[PDB]
RNA sequence: CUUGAGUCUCGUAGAGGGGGGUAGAAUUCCAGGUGUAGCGGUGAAAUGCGUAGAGAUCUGGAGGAAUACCGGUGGCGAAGGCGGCCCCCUGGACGAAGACUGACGCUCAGGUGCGAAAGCGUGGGGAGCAAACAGGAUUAGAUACCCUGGUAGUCCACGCCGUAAACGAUGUCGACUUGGAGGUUGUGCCCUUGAGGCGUGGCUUCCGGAGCUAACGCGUUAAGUCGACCGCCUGGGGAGUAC
RNA sequence: AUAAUGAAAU
């Protein structure tokens, strides 16, 4: 393949799952892994341990491109914000930046109604 | 509580004064509450008006990620 | 919350800076409170209740320091 | 007559028409028994966020006194001109003749 | 006649009302690039979407609804109510020092206007969510609560309807009667120590004395002490129902 | 997570 040496890791952390996607600096994808596809189902899919395992697997699945430097973008409120960043540091990359890009509306649309159970 | 505008006897806050307006916004671009900075209500209102005018004219940002 | 890792700077320090900045910005609170719709009556009621509780607690704690327990 | 403050912004690759624009608008205002209290040309500045895929706009500021029909016509000209990307018109209580913070520390 | 009630001159604060422009964040949809097995959801599940290439990430476009932070026992309005920025038309309140009119006032049966949400008629518009409706589940049953979808309506213009725990569950106007701590908006003077004190108006939150109250509590913004006018009650059901 | 009922008297 083609070497890159400089990449971005996108973390999508919801209350039910975690998705990790590694990309070049122009937004072209190279590999992905998720918490629900690493042997976890149901209640165990939303724990920091599952997020960690997914980070390890995503790091492994991109070893043919020879990446050295990584930026990190985090989006969402769920459990999995920090375990993933720790695992990426452990895997052996160099972190240059950390940014939060969680979206917030300046009073737009009406949310769904409150749950009564 | 100490208020610089009251101490200096100011009439308007001058939306063209980026240097002064920078002291009242955070690192994301949000206006700072009055109970932290110790301003008076009259001047807090004038200040919010000025900051909104500057945001529209593009001398100040809306958020730190554009 | 934008964090740039400084030269010679370890990784734990940068991570802690990230956490502190996010706490200062307060994004989790906004996300949690925007999850479901709230009616204007409920909003007004919550605000009033908070004010009354804070006032009463302040008065009680300021007036409780004039008595001896033993 | 009332007192107005005007600001307008121009495309960076059309900075060679600003003097002609200023002359034309000033003539229009002065031809109707108006006055001009302050005029300033700030040059090109970096924007805080992009507008139409641009940075680096050219800025002009004016402070005048005139009737309302003239201000209406000026706004129509701004609307239908394509060199102008943004503009603002505001009302004031008195005439302003002092210098702005942009011509004291730039 | 000038003390009640009004007119004139200078200023101040305000999401008070009607009309027209415009800006940035976010949701949905449409067309492309990279990439490959899962996504979404629950207390636990499955209906649903996916190799006909989803979800994730990057670039371009369309549309209509609401305005983070400021923002508070904060402001304005007769009540109902009113919140991004700029312009046009417009109503009320308050303060300082003077001038002017001369009781021109208070209350109001019948009458006439204004009046949240939902609903109705004609013509438009439709991201988001949502009565009705359909299918997962739970359960002895589940016409429900929880999940996946979803149209009337919610939006604009003009015209109807006239009701709400429309609440301070406390009609409008005027006079008198010990105190303490705050908020907001005007104005006068100065020991002179140029940064602080001493006064005088309008609105507003909390505590509490005499008096009052069946009690809970109210307490100069009275439910205390008085005067003028209006509306309403007379055991529980039947019934705010029938003609 | 959900999860019903008990004649009248003394």
PDB file of C-alpha atoms in Angstrom, chain A residues 20-81:
ATOM      1  CA  UNK A  20     -13.127   4.250  16.339  1.00  0.00           C
ATOM      2  CA  UNK A  21     -12.057   5.232  12.821  1.00  0.00           C
ATOM      3  CA  UNK A  22      -8.523   6.056  11.641  1.00  0.00           C
ATOM      4  CA  UNK A  23      -8.106   8.287   8.622  1.00  0.00           C
ATOM      5  CA  UNK A  24      -5.524  10.303   6.727  1.00  0.00           C
ATOM      6  CA  UNK A  25      -5.415  14.100   7.008  1.00  0.00           C
ATOM      7  CA  UNK A  26      -7.953  14.635   4.215  1.00  0.00           C
ATOM      8  CA  UNK A  27     -10.698  12.378   5.559  1.00  0.00           C
ATOM      9  CA  UNK A  28     -10.055   9.163   3.616  1.00  0.00           C
ATOM     10  CA  UNK A  29     -10.622   6.108   5.789  1.00  0.00           C
ATOM     11  CA  UNK A  30      -8.168   3.260   6.413  1.00  0.00           C
ATOM     12  CA  UNK A  31      -9.688   1.030   9.120  1.00  0.00           C
ATOM     13  CA  UNK A  32     -12.311   0.755  11.836  1.00  0.00           C
ATOM     14  CA  UNK A  33     -13.427  -1.307  14.822  1.00  0.00           C
ATOM     15  CA  UNK A  34     -16.362  -1.139  17.235  1.00  0.00           C
ATOM     16  CA  UNK A  35     -17.139  -2.258  20.767  1.00  0.00           C
ATOM     17  CA  UNK A  36     -20.136  -4.353  19.746  1.00  0.00           C
ATOM     18  CA  UNK A  37     -18.069  -6.404  17.295  1.00  0.00           C
ATOM     19  CA  UNK A  38     -15.318  -7.445  19.735  1.00  0.00           C
ATOM     20  CA  UNK A  39     -17.192 -10.150  21.629  1.00  0.00           C
ATOM     21  CA  UNK A  40     -19.535  -7.983  23.718  1.00  0.00           C
ATOM     22  CA  UNK A  41     -23.335  -7.895  23.622  1.00  0.00           C
ATOM     23  CA  UNK A  42     -25.903  -5.890  25.554  1.00  0.00           C
ATOM     24  CA  UNK A  43     -24.870  -4.397  28.887  1.00  0.00           C
ATOM     25  CA  UNK A  44     -21.193  -5.239  28.282  1.00  0.00           C
ATOM     26  CA  UNK A  45     -21.164  -3.221  25.063  1.00  0.00           C
ATOM     27  CA  UNK A  46     -21.215   0.126  26.922  1.00  0.00           C
ATOM     28  CA  UNK A  47     -18.288  -0.327  29.315  1.00  0.00           C
ATOM     29  CA  UNK A  48     -14.780   1.212  29.251  1.00  0.00           C
ATOM     30  CA  UNK A  49     -13.202  -2.238  28.861  1.00  0.00           C
ATOM     31  CA  UNK A  50     -14.999  -2.831  25.556  1.00  0.00           C
ATOM     32  CA  UNK A  51     -13.886   0.582  24.288  1.00  0.00           C
ATOM     33  CA  UNK A  52     -10.297  -0.302  25.184  1.00  0.00           C
ATOM     34  CA  UNK A  53     -10.451  -3.604  23.295  1.00  0.00           C
ATOM     35  CA  UNK A  54     -11.855  -1.819  20.250  1.00  0.00           C
ATOM     36  CA  UNK A  55      -8.988   0.681  20.344  1.00  0.00           C
ATOM     37  CA  UNK A  56      -6.465  -2.180  20.360  1.00  0.00           C
ATOM     38  CA  UNK A  57      -8.121  -3.880  17.392  1.00  0.00           C
ATOM     39  CA  UNK A  58      -8.306  -0.670  15.363  1.00  0.00           C
ATOM     40  CA  UNK A  59      -4.617  -0.031  16.023  1.00  0.00           C
ATOM     41  CA  UNK A  60      -3.771  -3.522  14.814  1.00  0.00           C
ATOM     42  CA  UNK A  61      -5.871  -3.333  11.654  1.00  0.00           C
ATOM     43  CA  UNK A  62      -3.825  -0.445  10.193  1.00  0.00           C
ATOM     44  CA  UNK A  63      -0.284  -1.731  10.732  1.00  0.00           C
ATOM     45  CA  UNK A  64       0.462  -1.986   7.002  1.00  0.00           C
ATOM     46  CA  UNK A  65       0.438   1.786   6.425  1.00  0.00           C
ATOM     47  CA  UNK A  66       3.311   2.629   8.773  1.00  0.00           C
ATOM     48  CA  UNK A  67       1.712   5.393  10.846  1.00  0.00           C
ATOM     49  CA  UNK A  68       3.747   7.340  13.397  1.00  0.00           C
ATOM     50  CA  UNK A  69       1.813  10.480  14.392  1.00  0.00           C
ATOM     51  CA  UNK A  70      -1.841  10.786  15.395  1.00  0.00           C
ATOM     52  CA  UNK A  71      -4.322  13.546  16.131  1.00  0.00           C
ATOM     53  CA  UNK A  72      -7.390  12.670  18.210  1.00  0.00           C
ATOM     54  CA  UNK A  73     -10.962  13.965  17.880  1.00  0.00           C
ATOM     55  CA  UNK A  74     -13.629  12.963  20.417  1.00  0.00           C
ATOM     56  CA  UNK A  75     -17.391  13.292  19.957  1.00  0.00           C
ATOM     57  CA  UNK A  76     -20.117  12.242  22.377  1.00  0.00           C
ATOM     58  CA  UNK A  77     -20.982  11.902  26.070  1.00  0.00           C
ATOM     59  CA  UNK A  78     -20.693   8.170  26.665  1.00  0.00           C
ATOM     60  CA  UNK A  79     -18.263   5.983  28.587  1.00  0.00           C
ATOM     61  CA  UNK A  80     -15.288   5.498  26.326  1.00  0.00           C
ATOM     62  CA  UNK A  81     -13.913   9.012  26.020  1.00  0.00           C
TER      63      UNK A  81
END
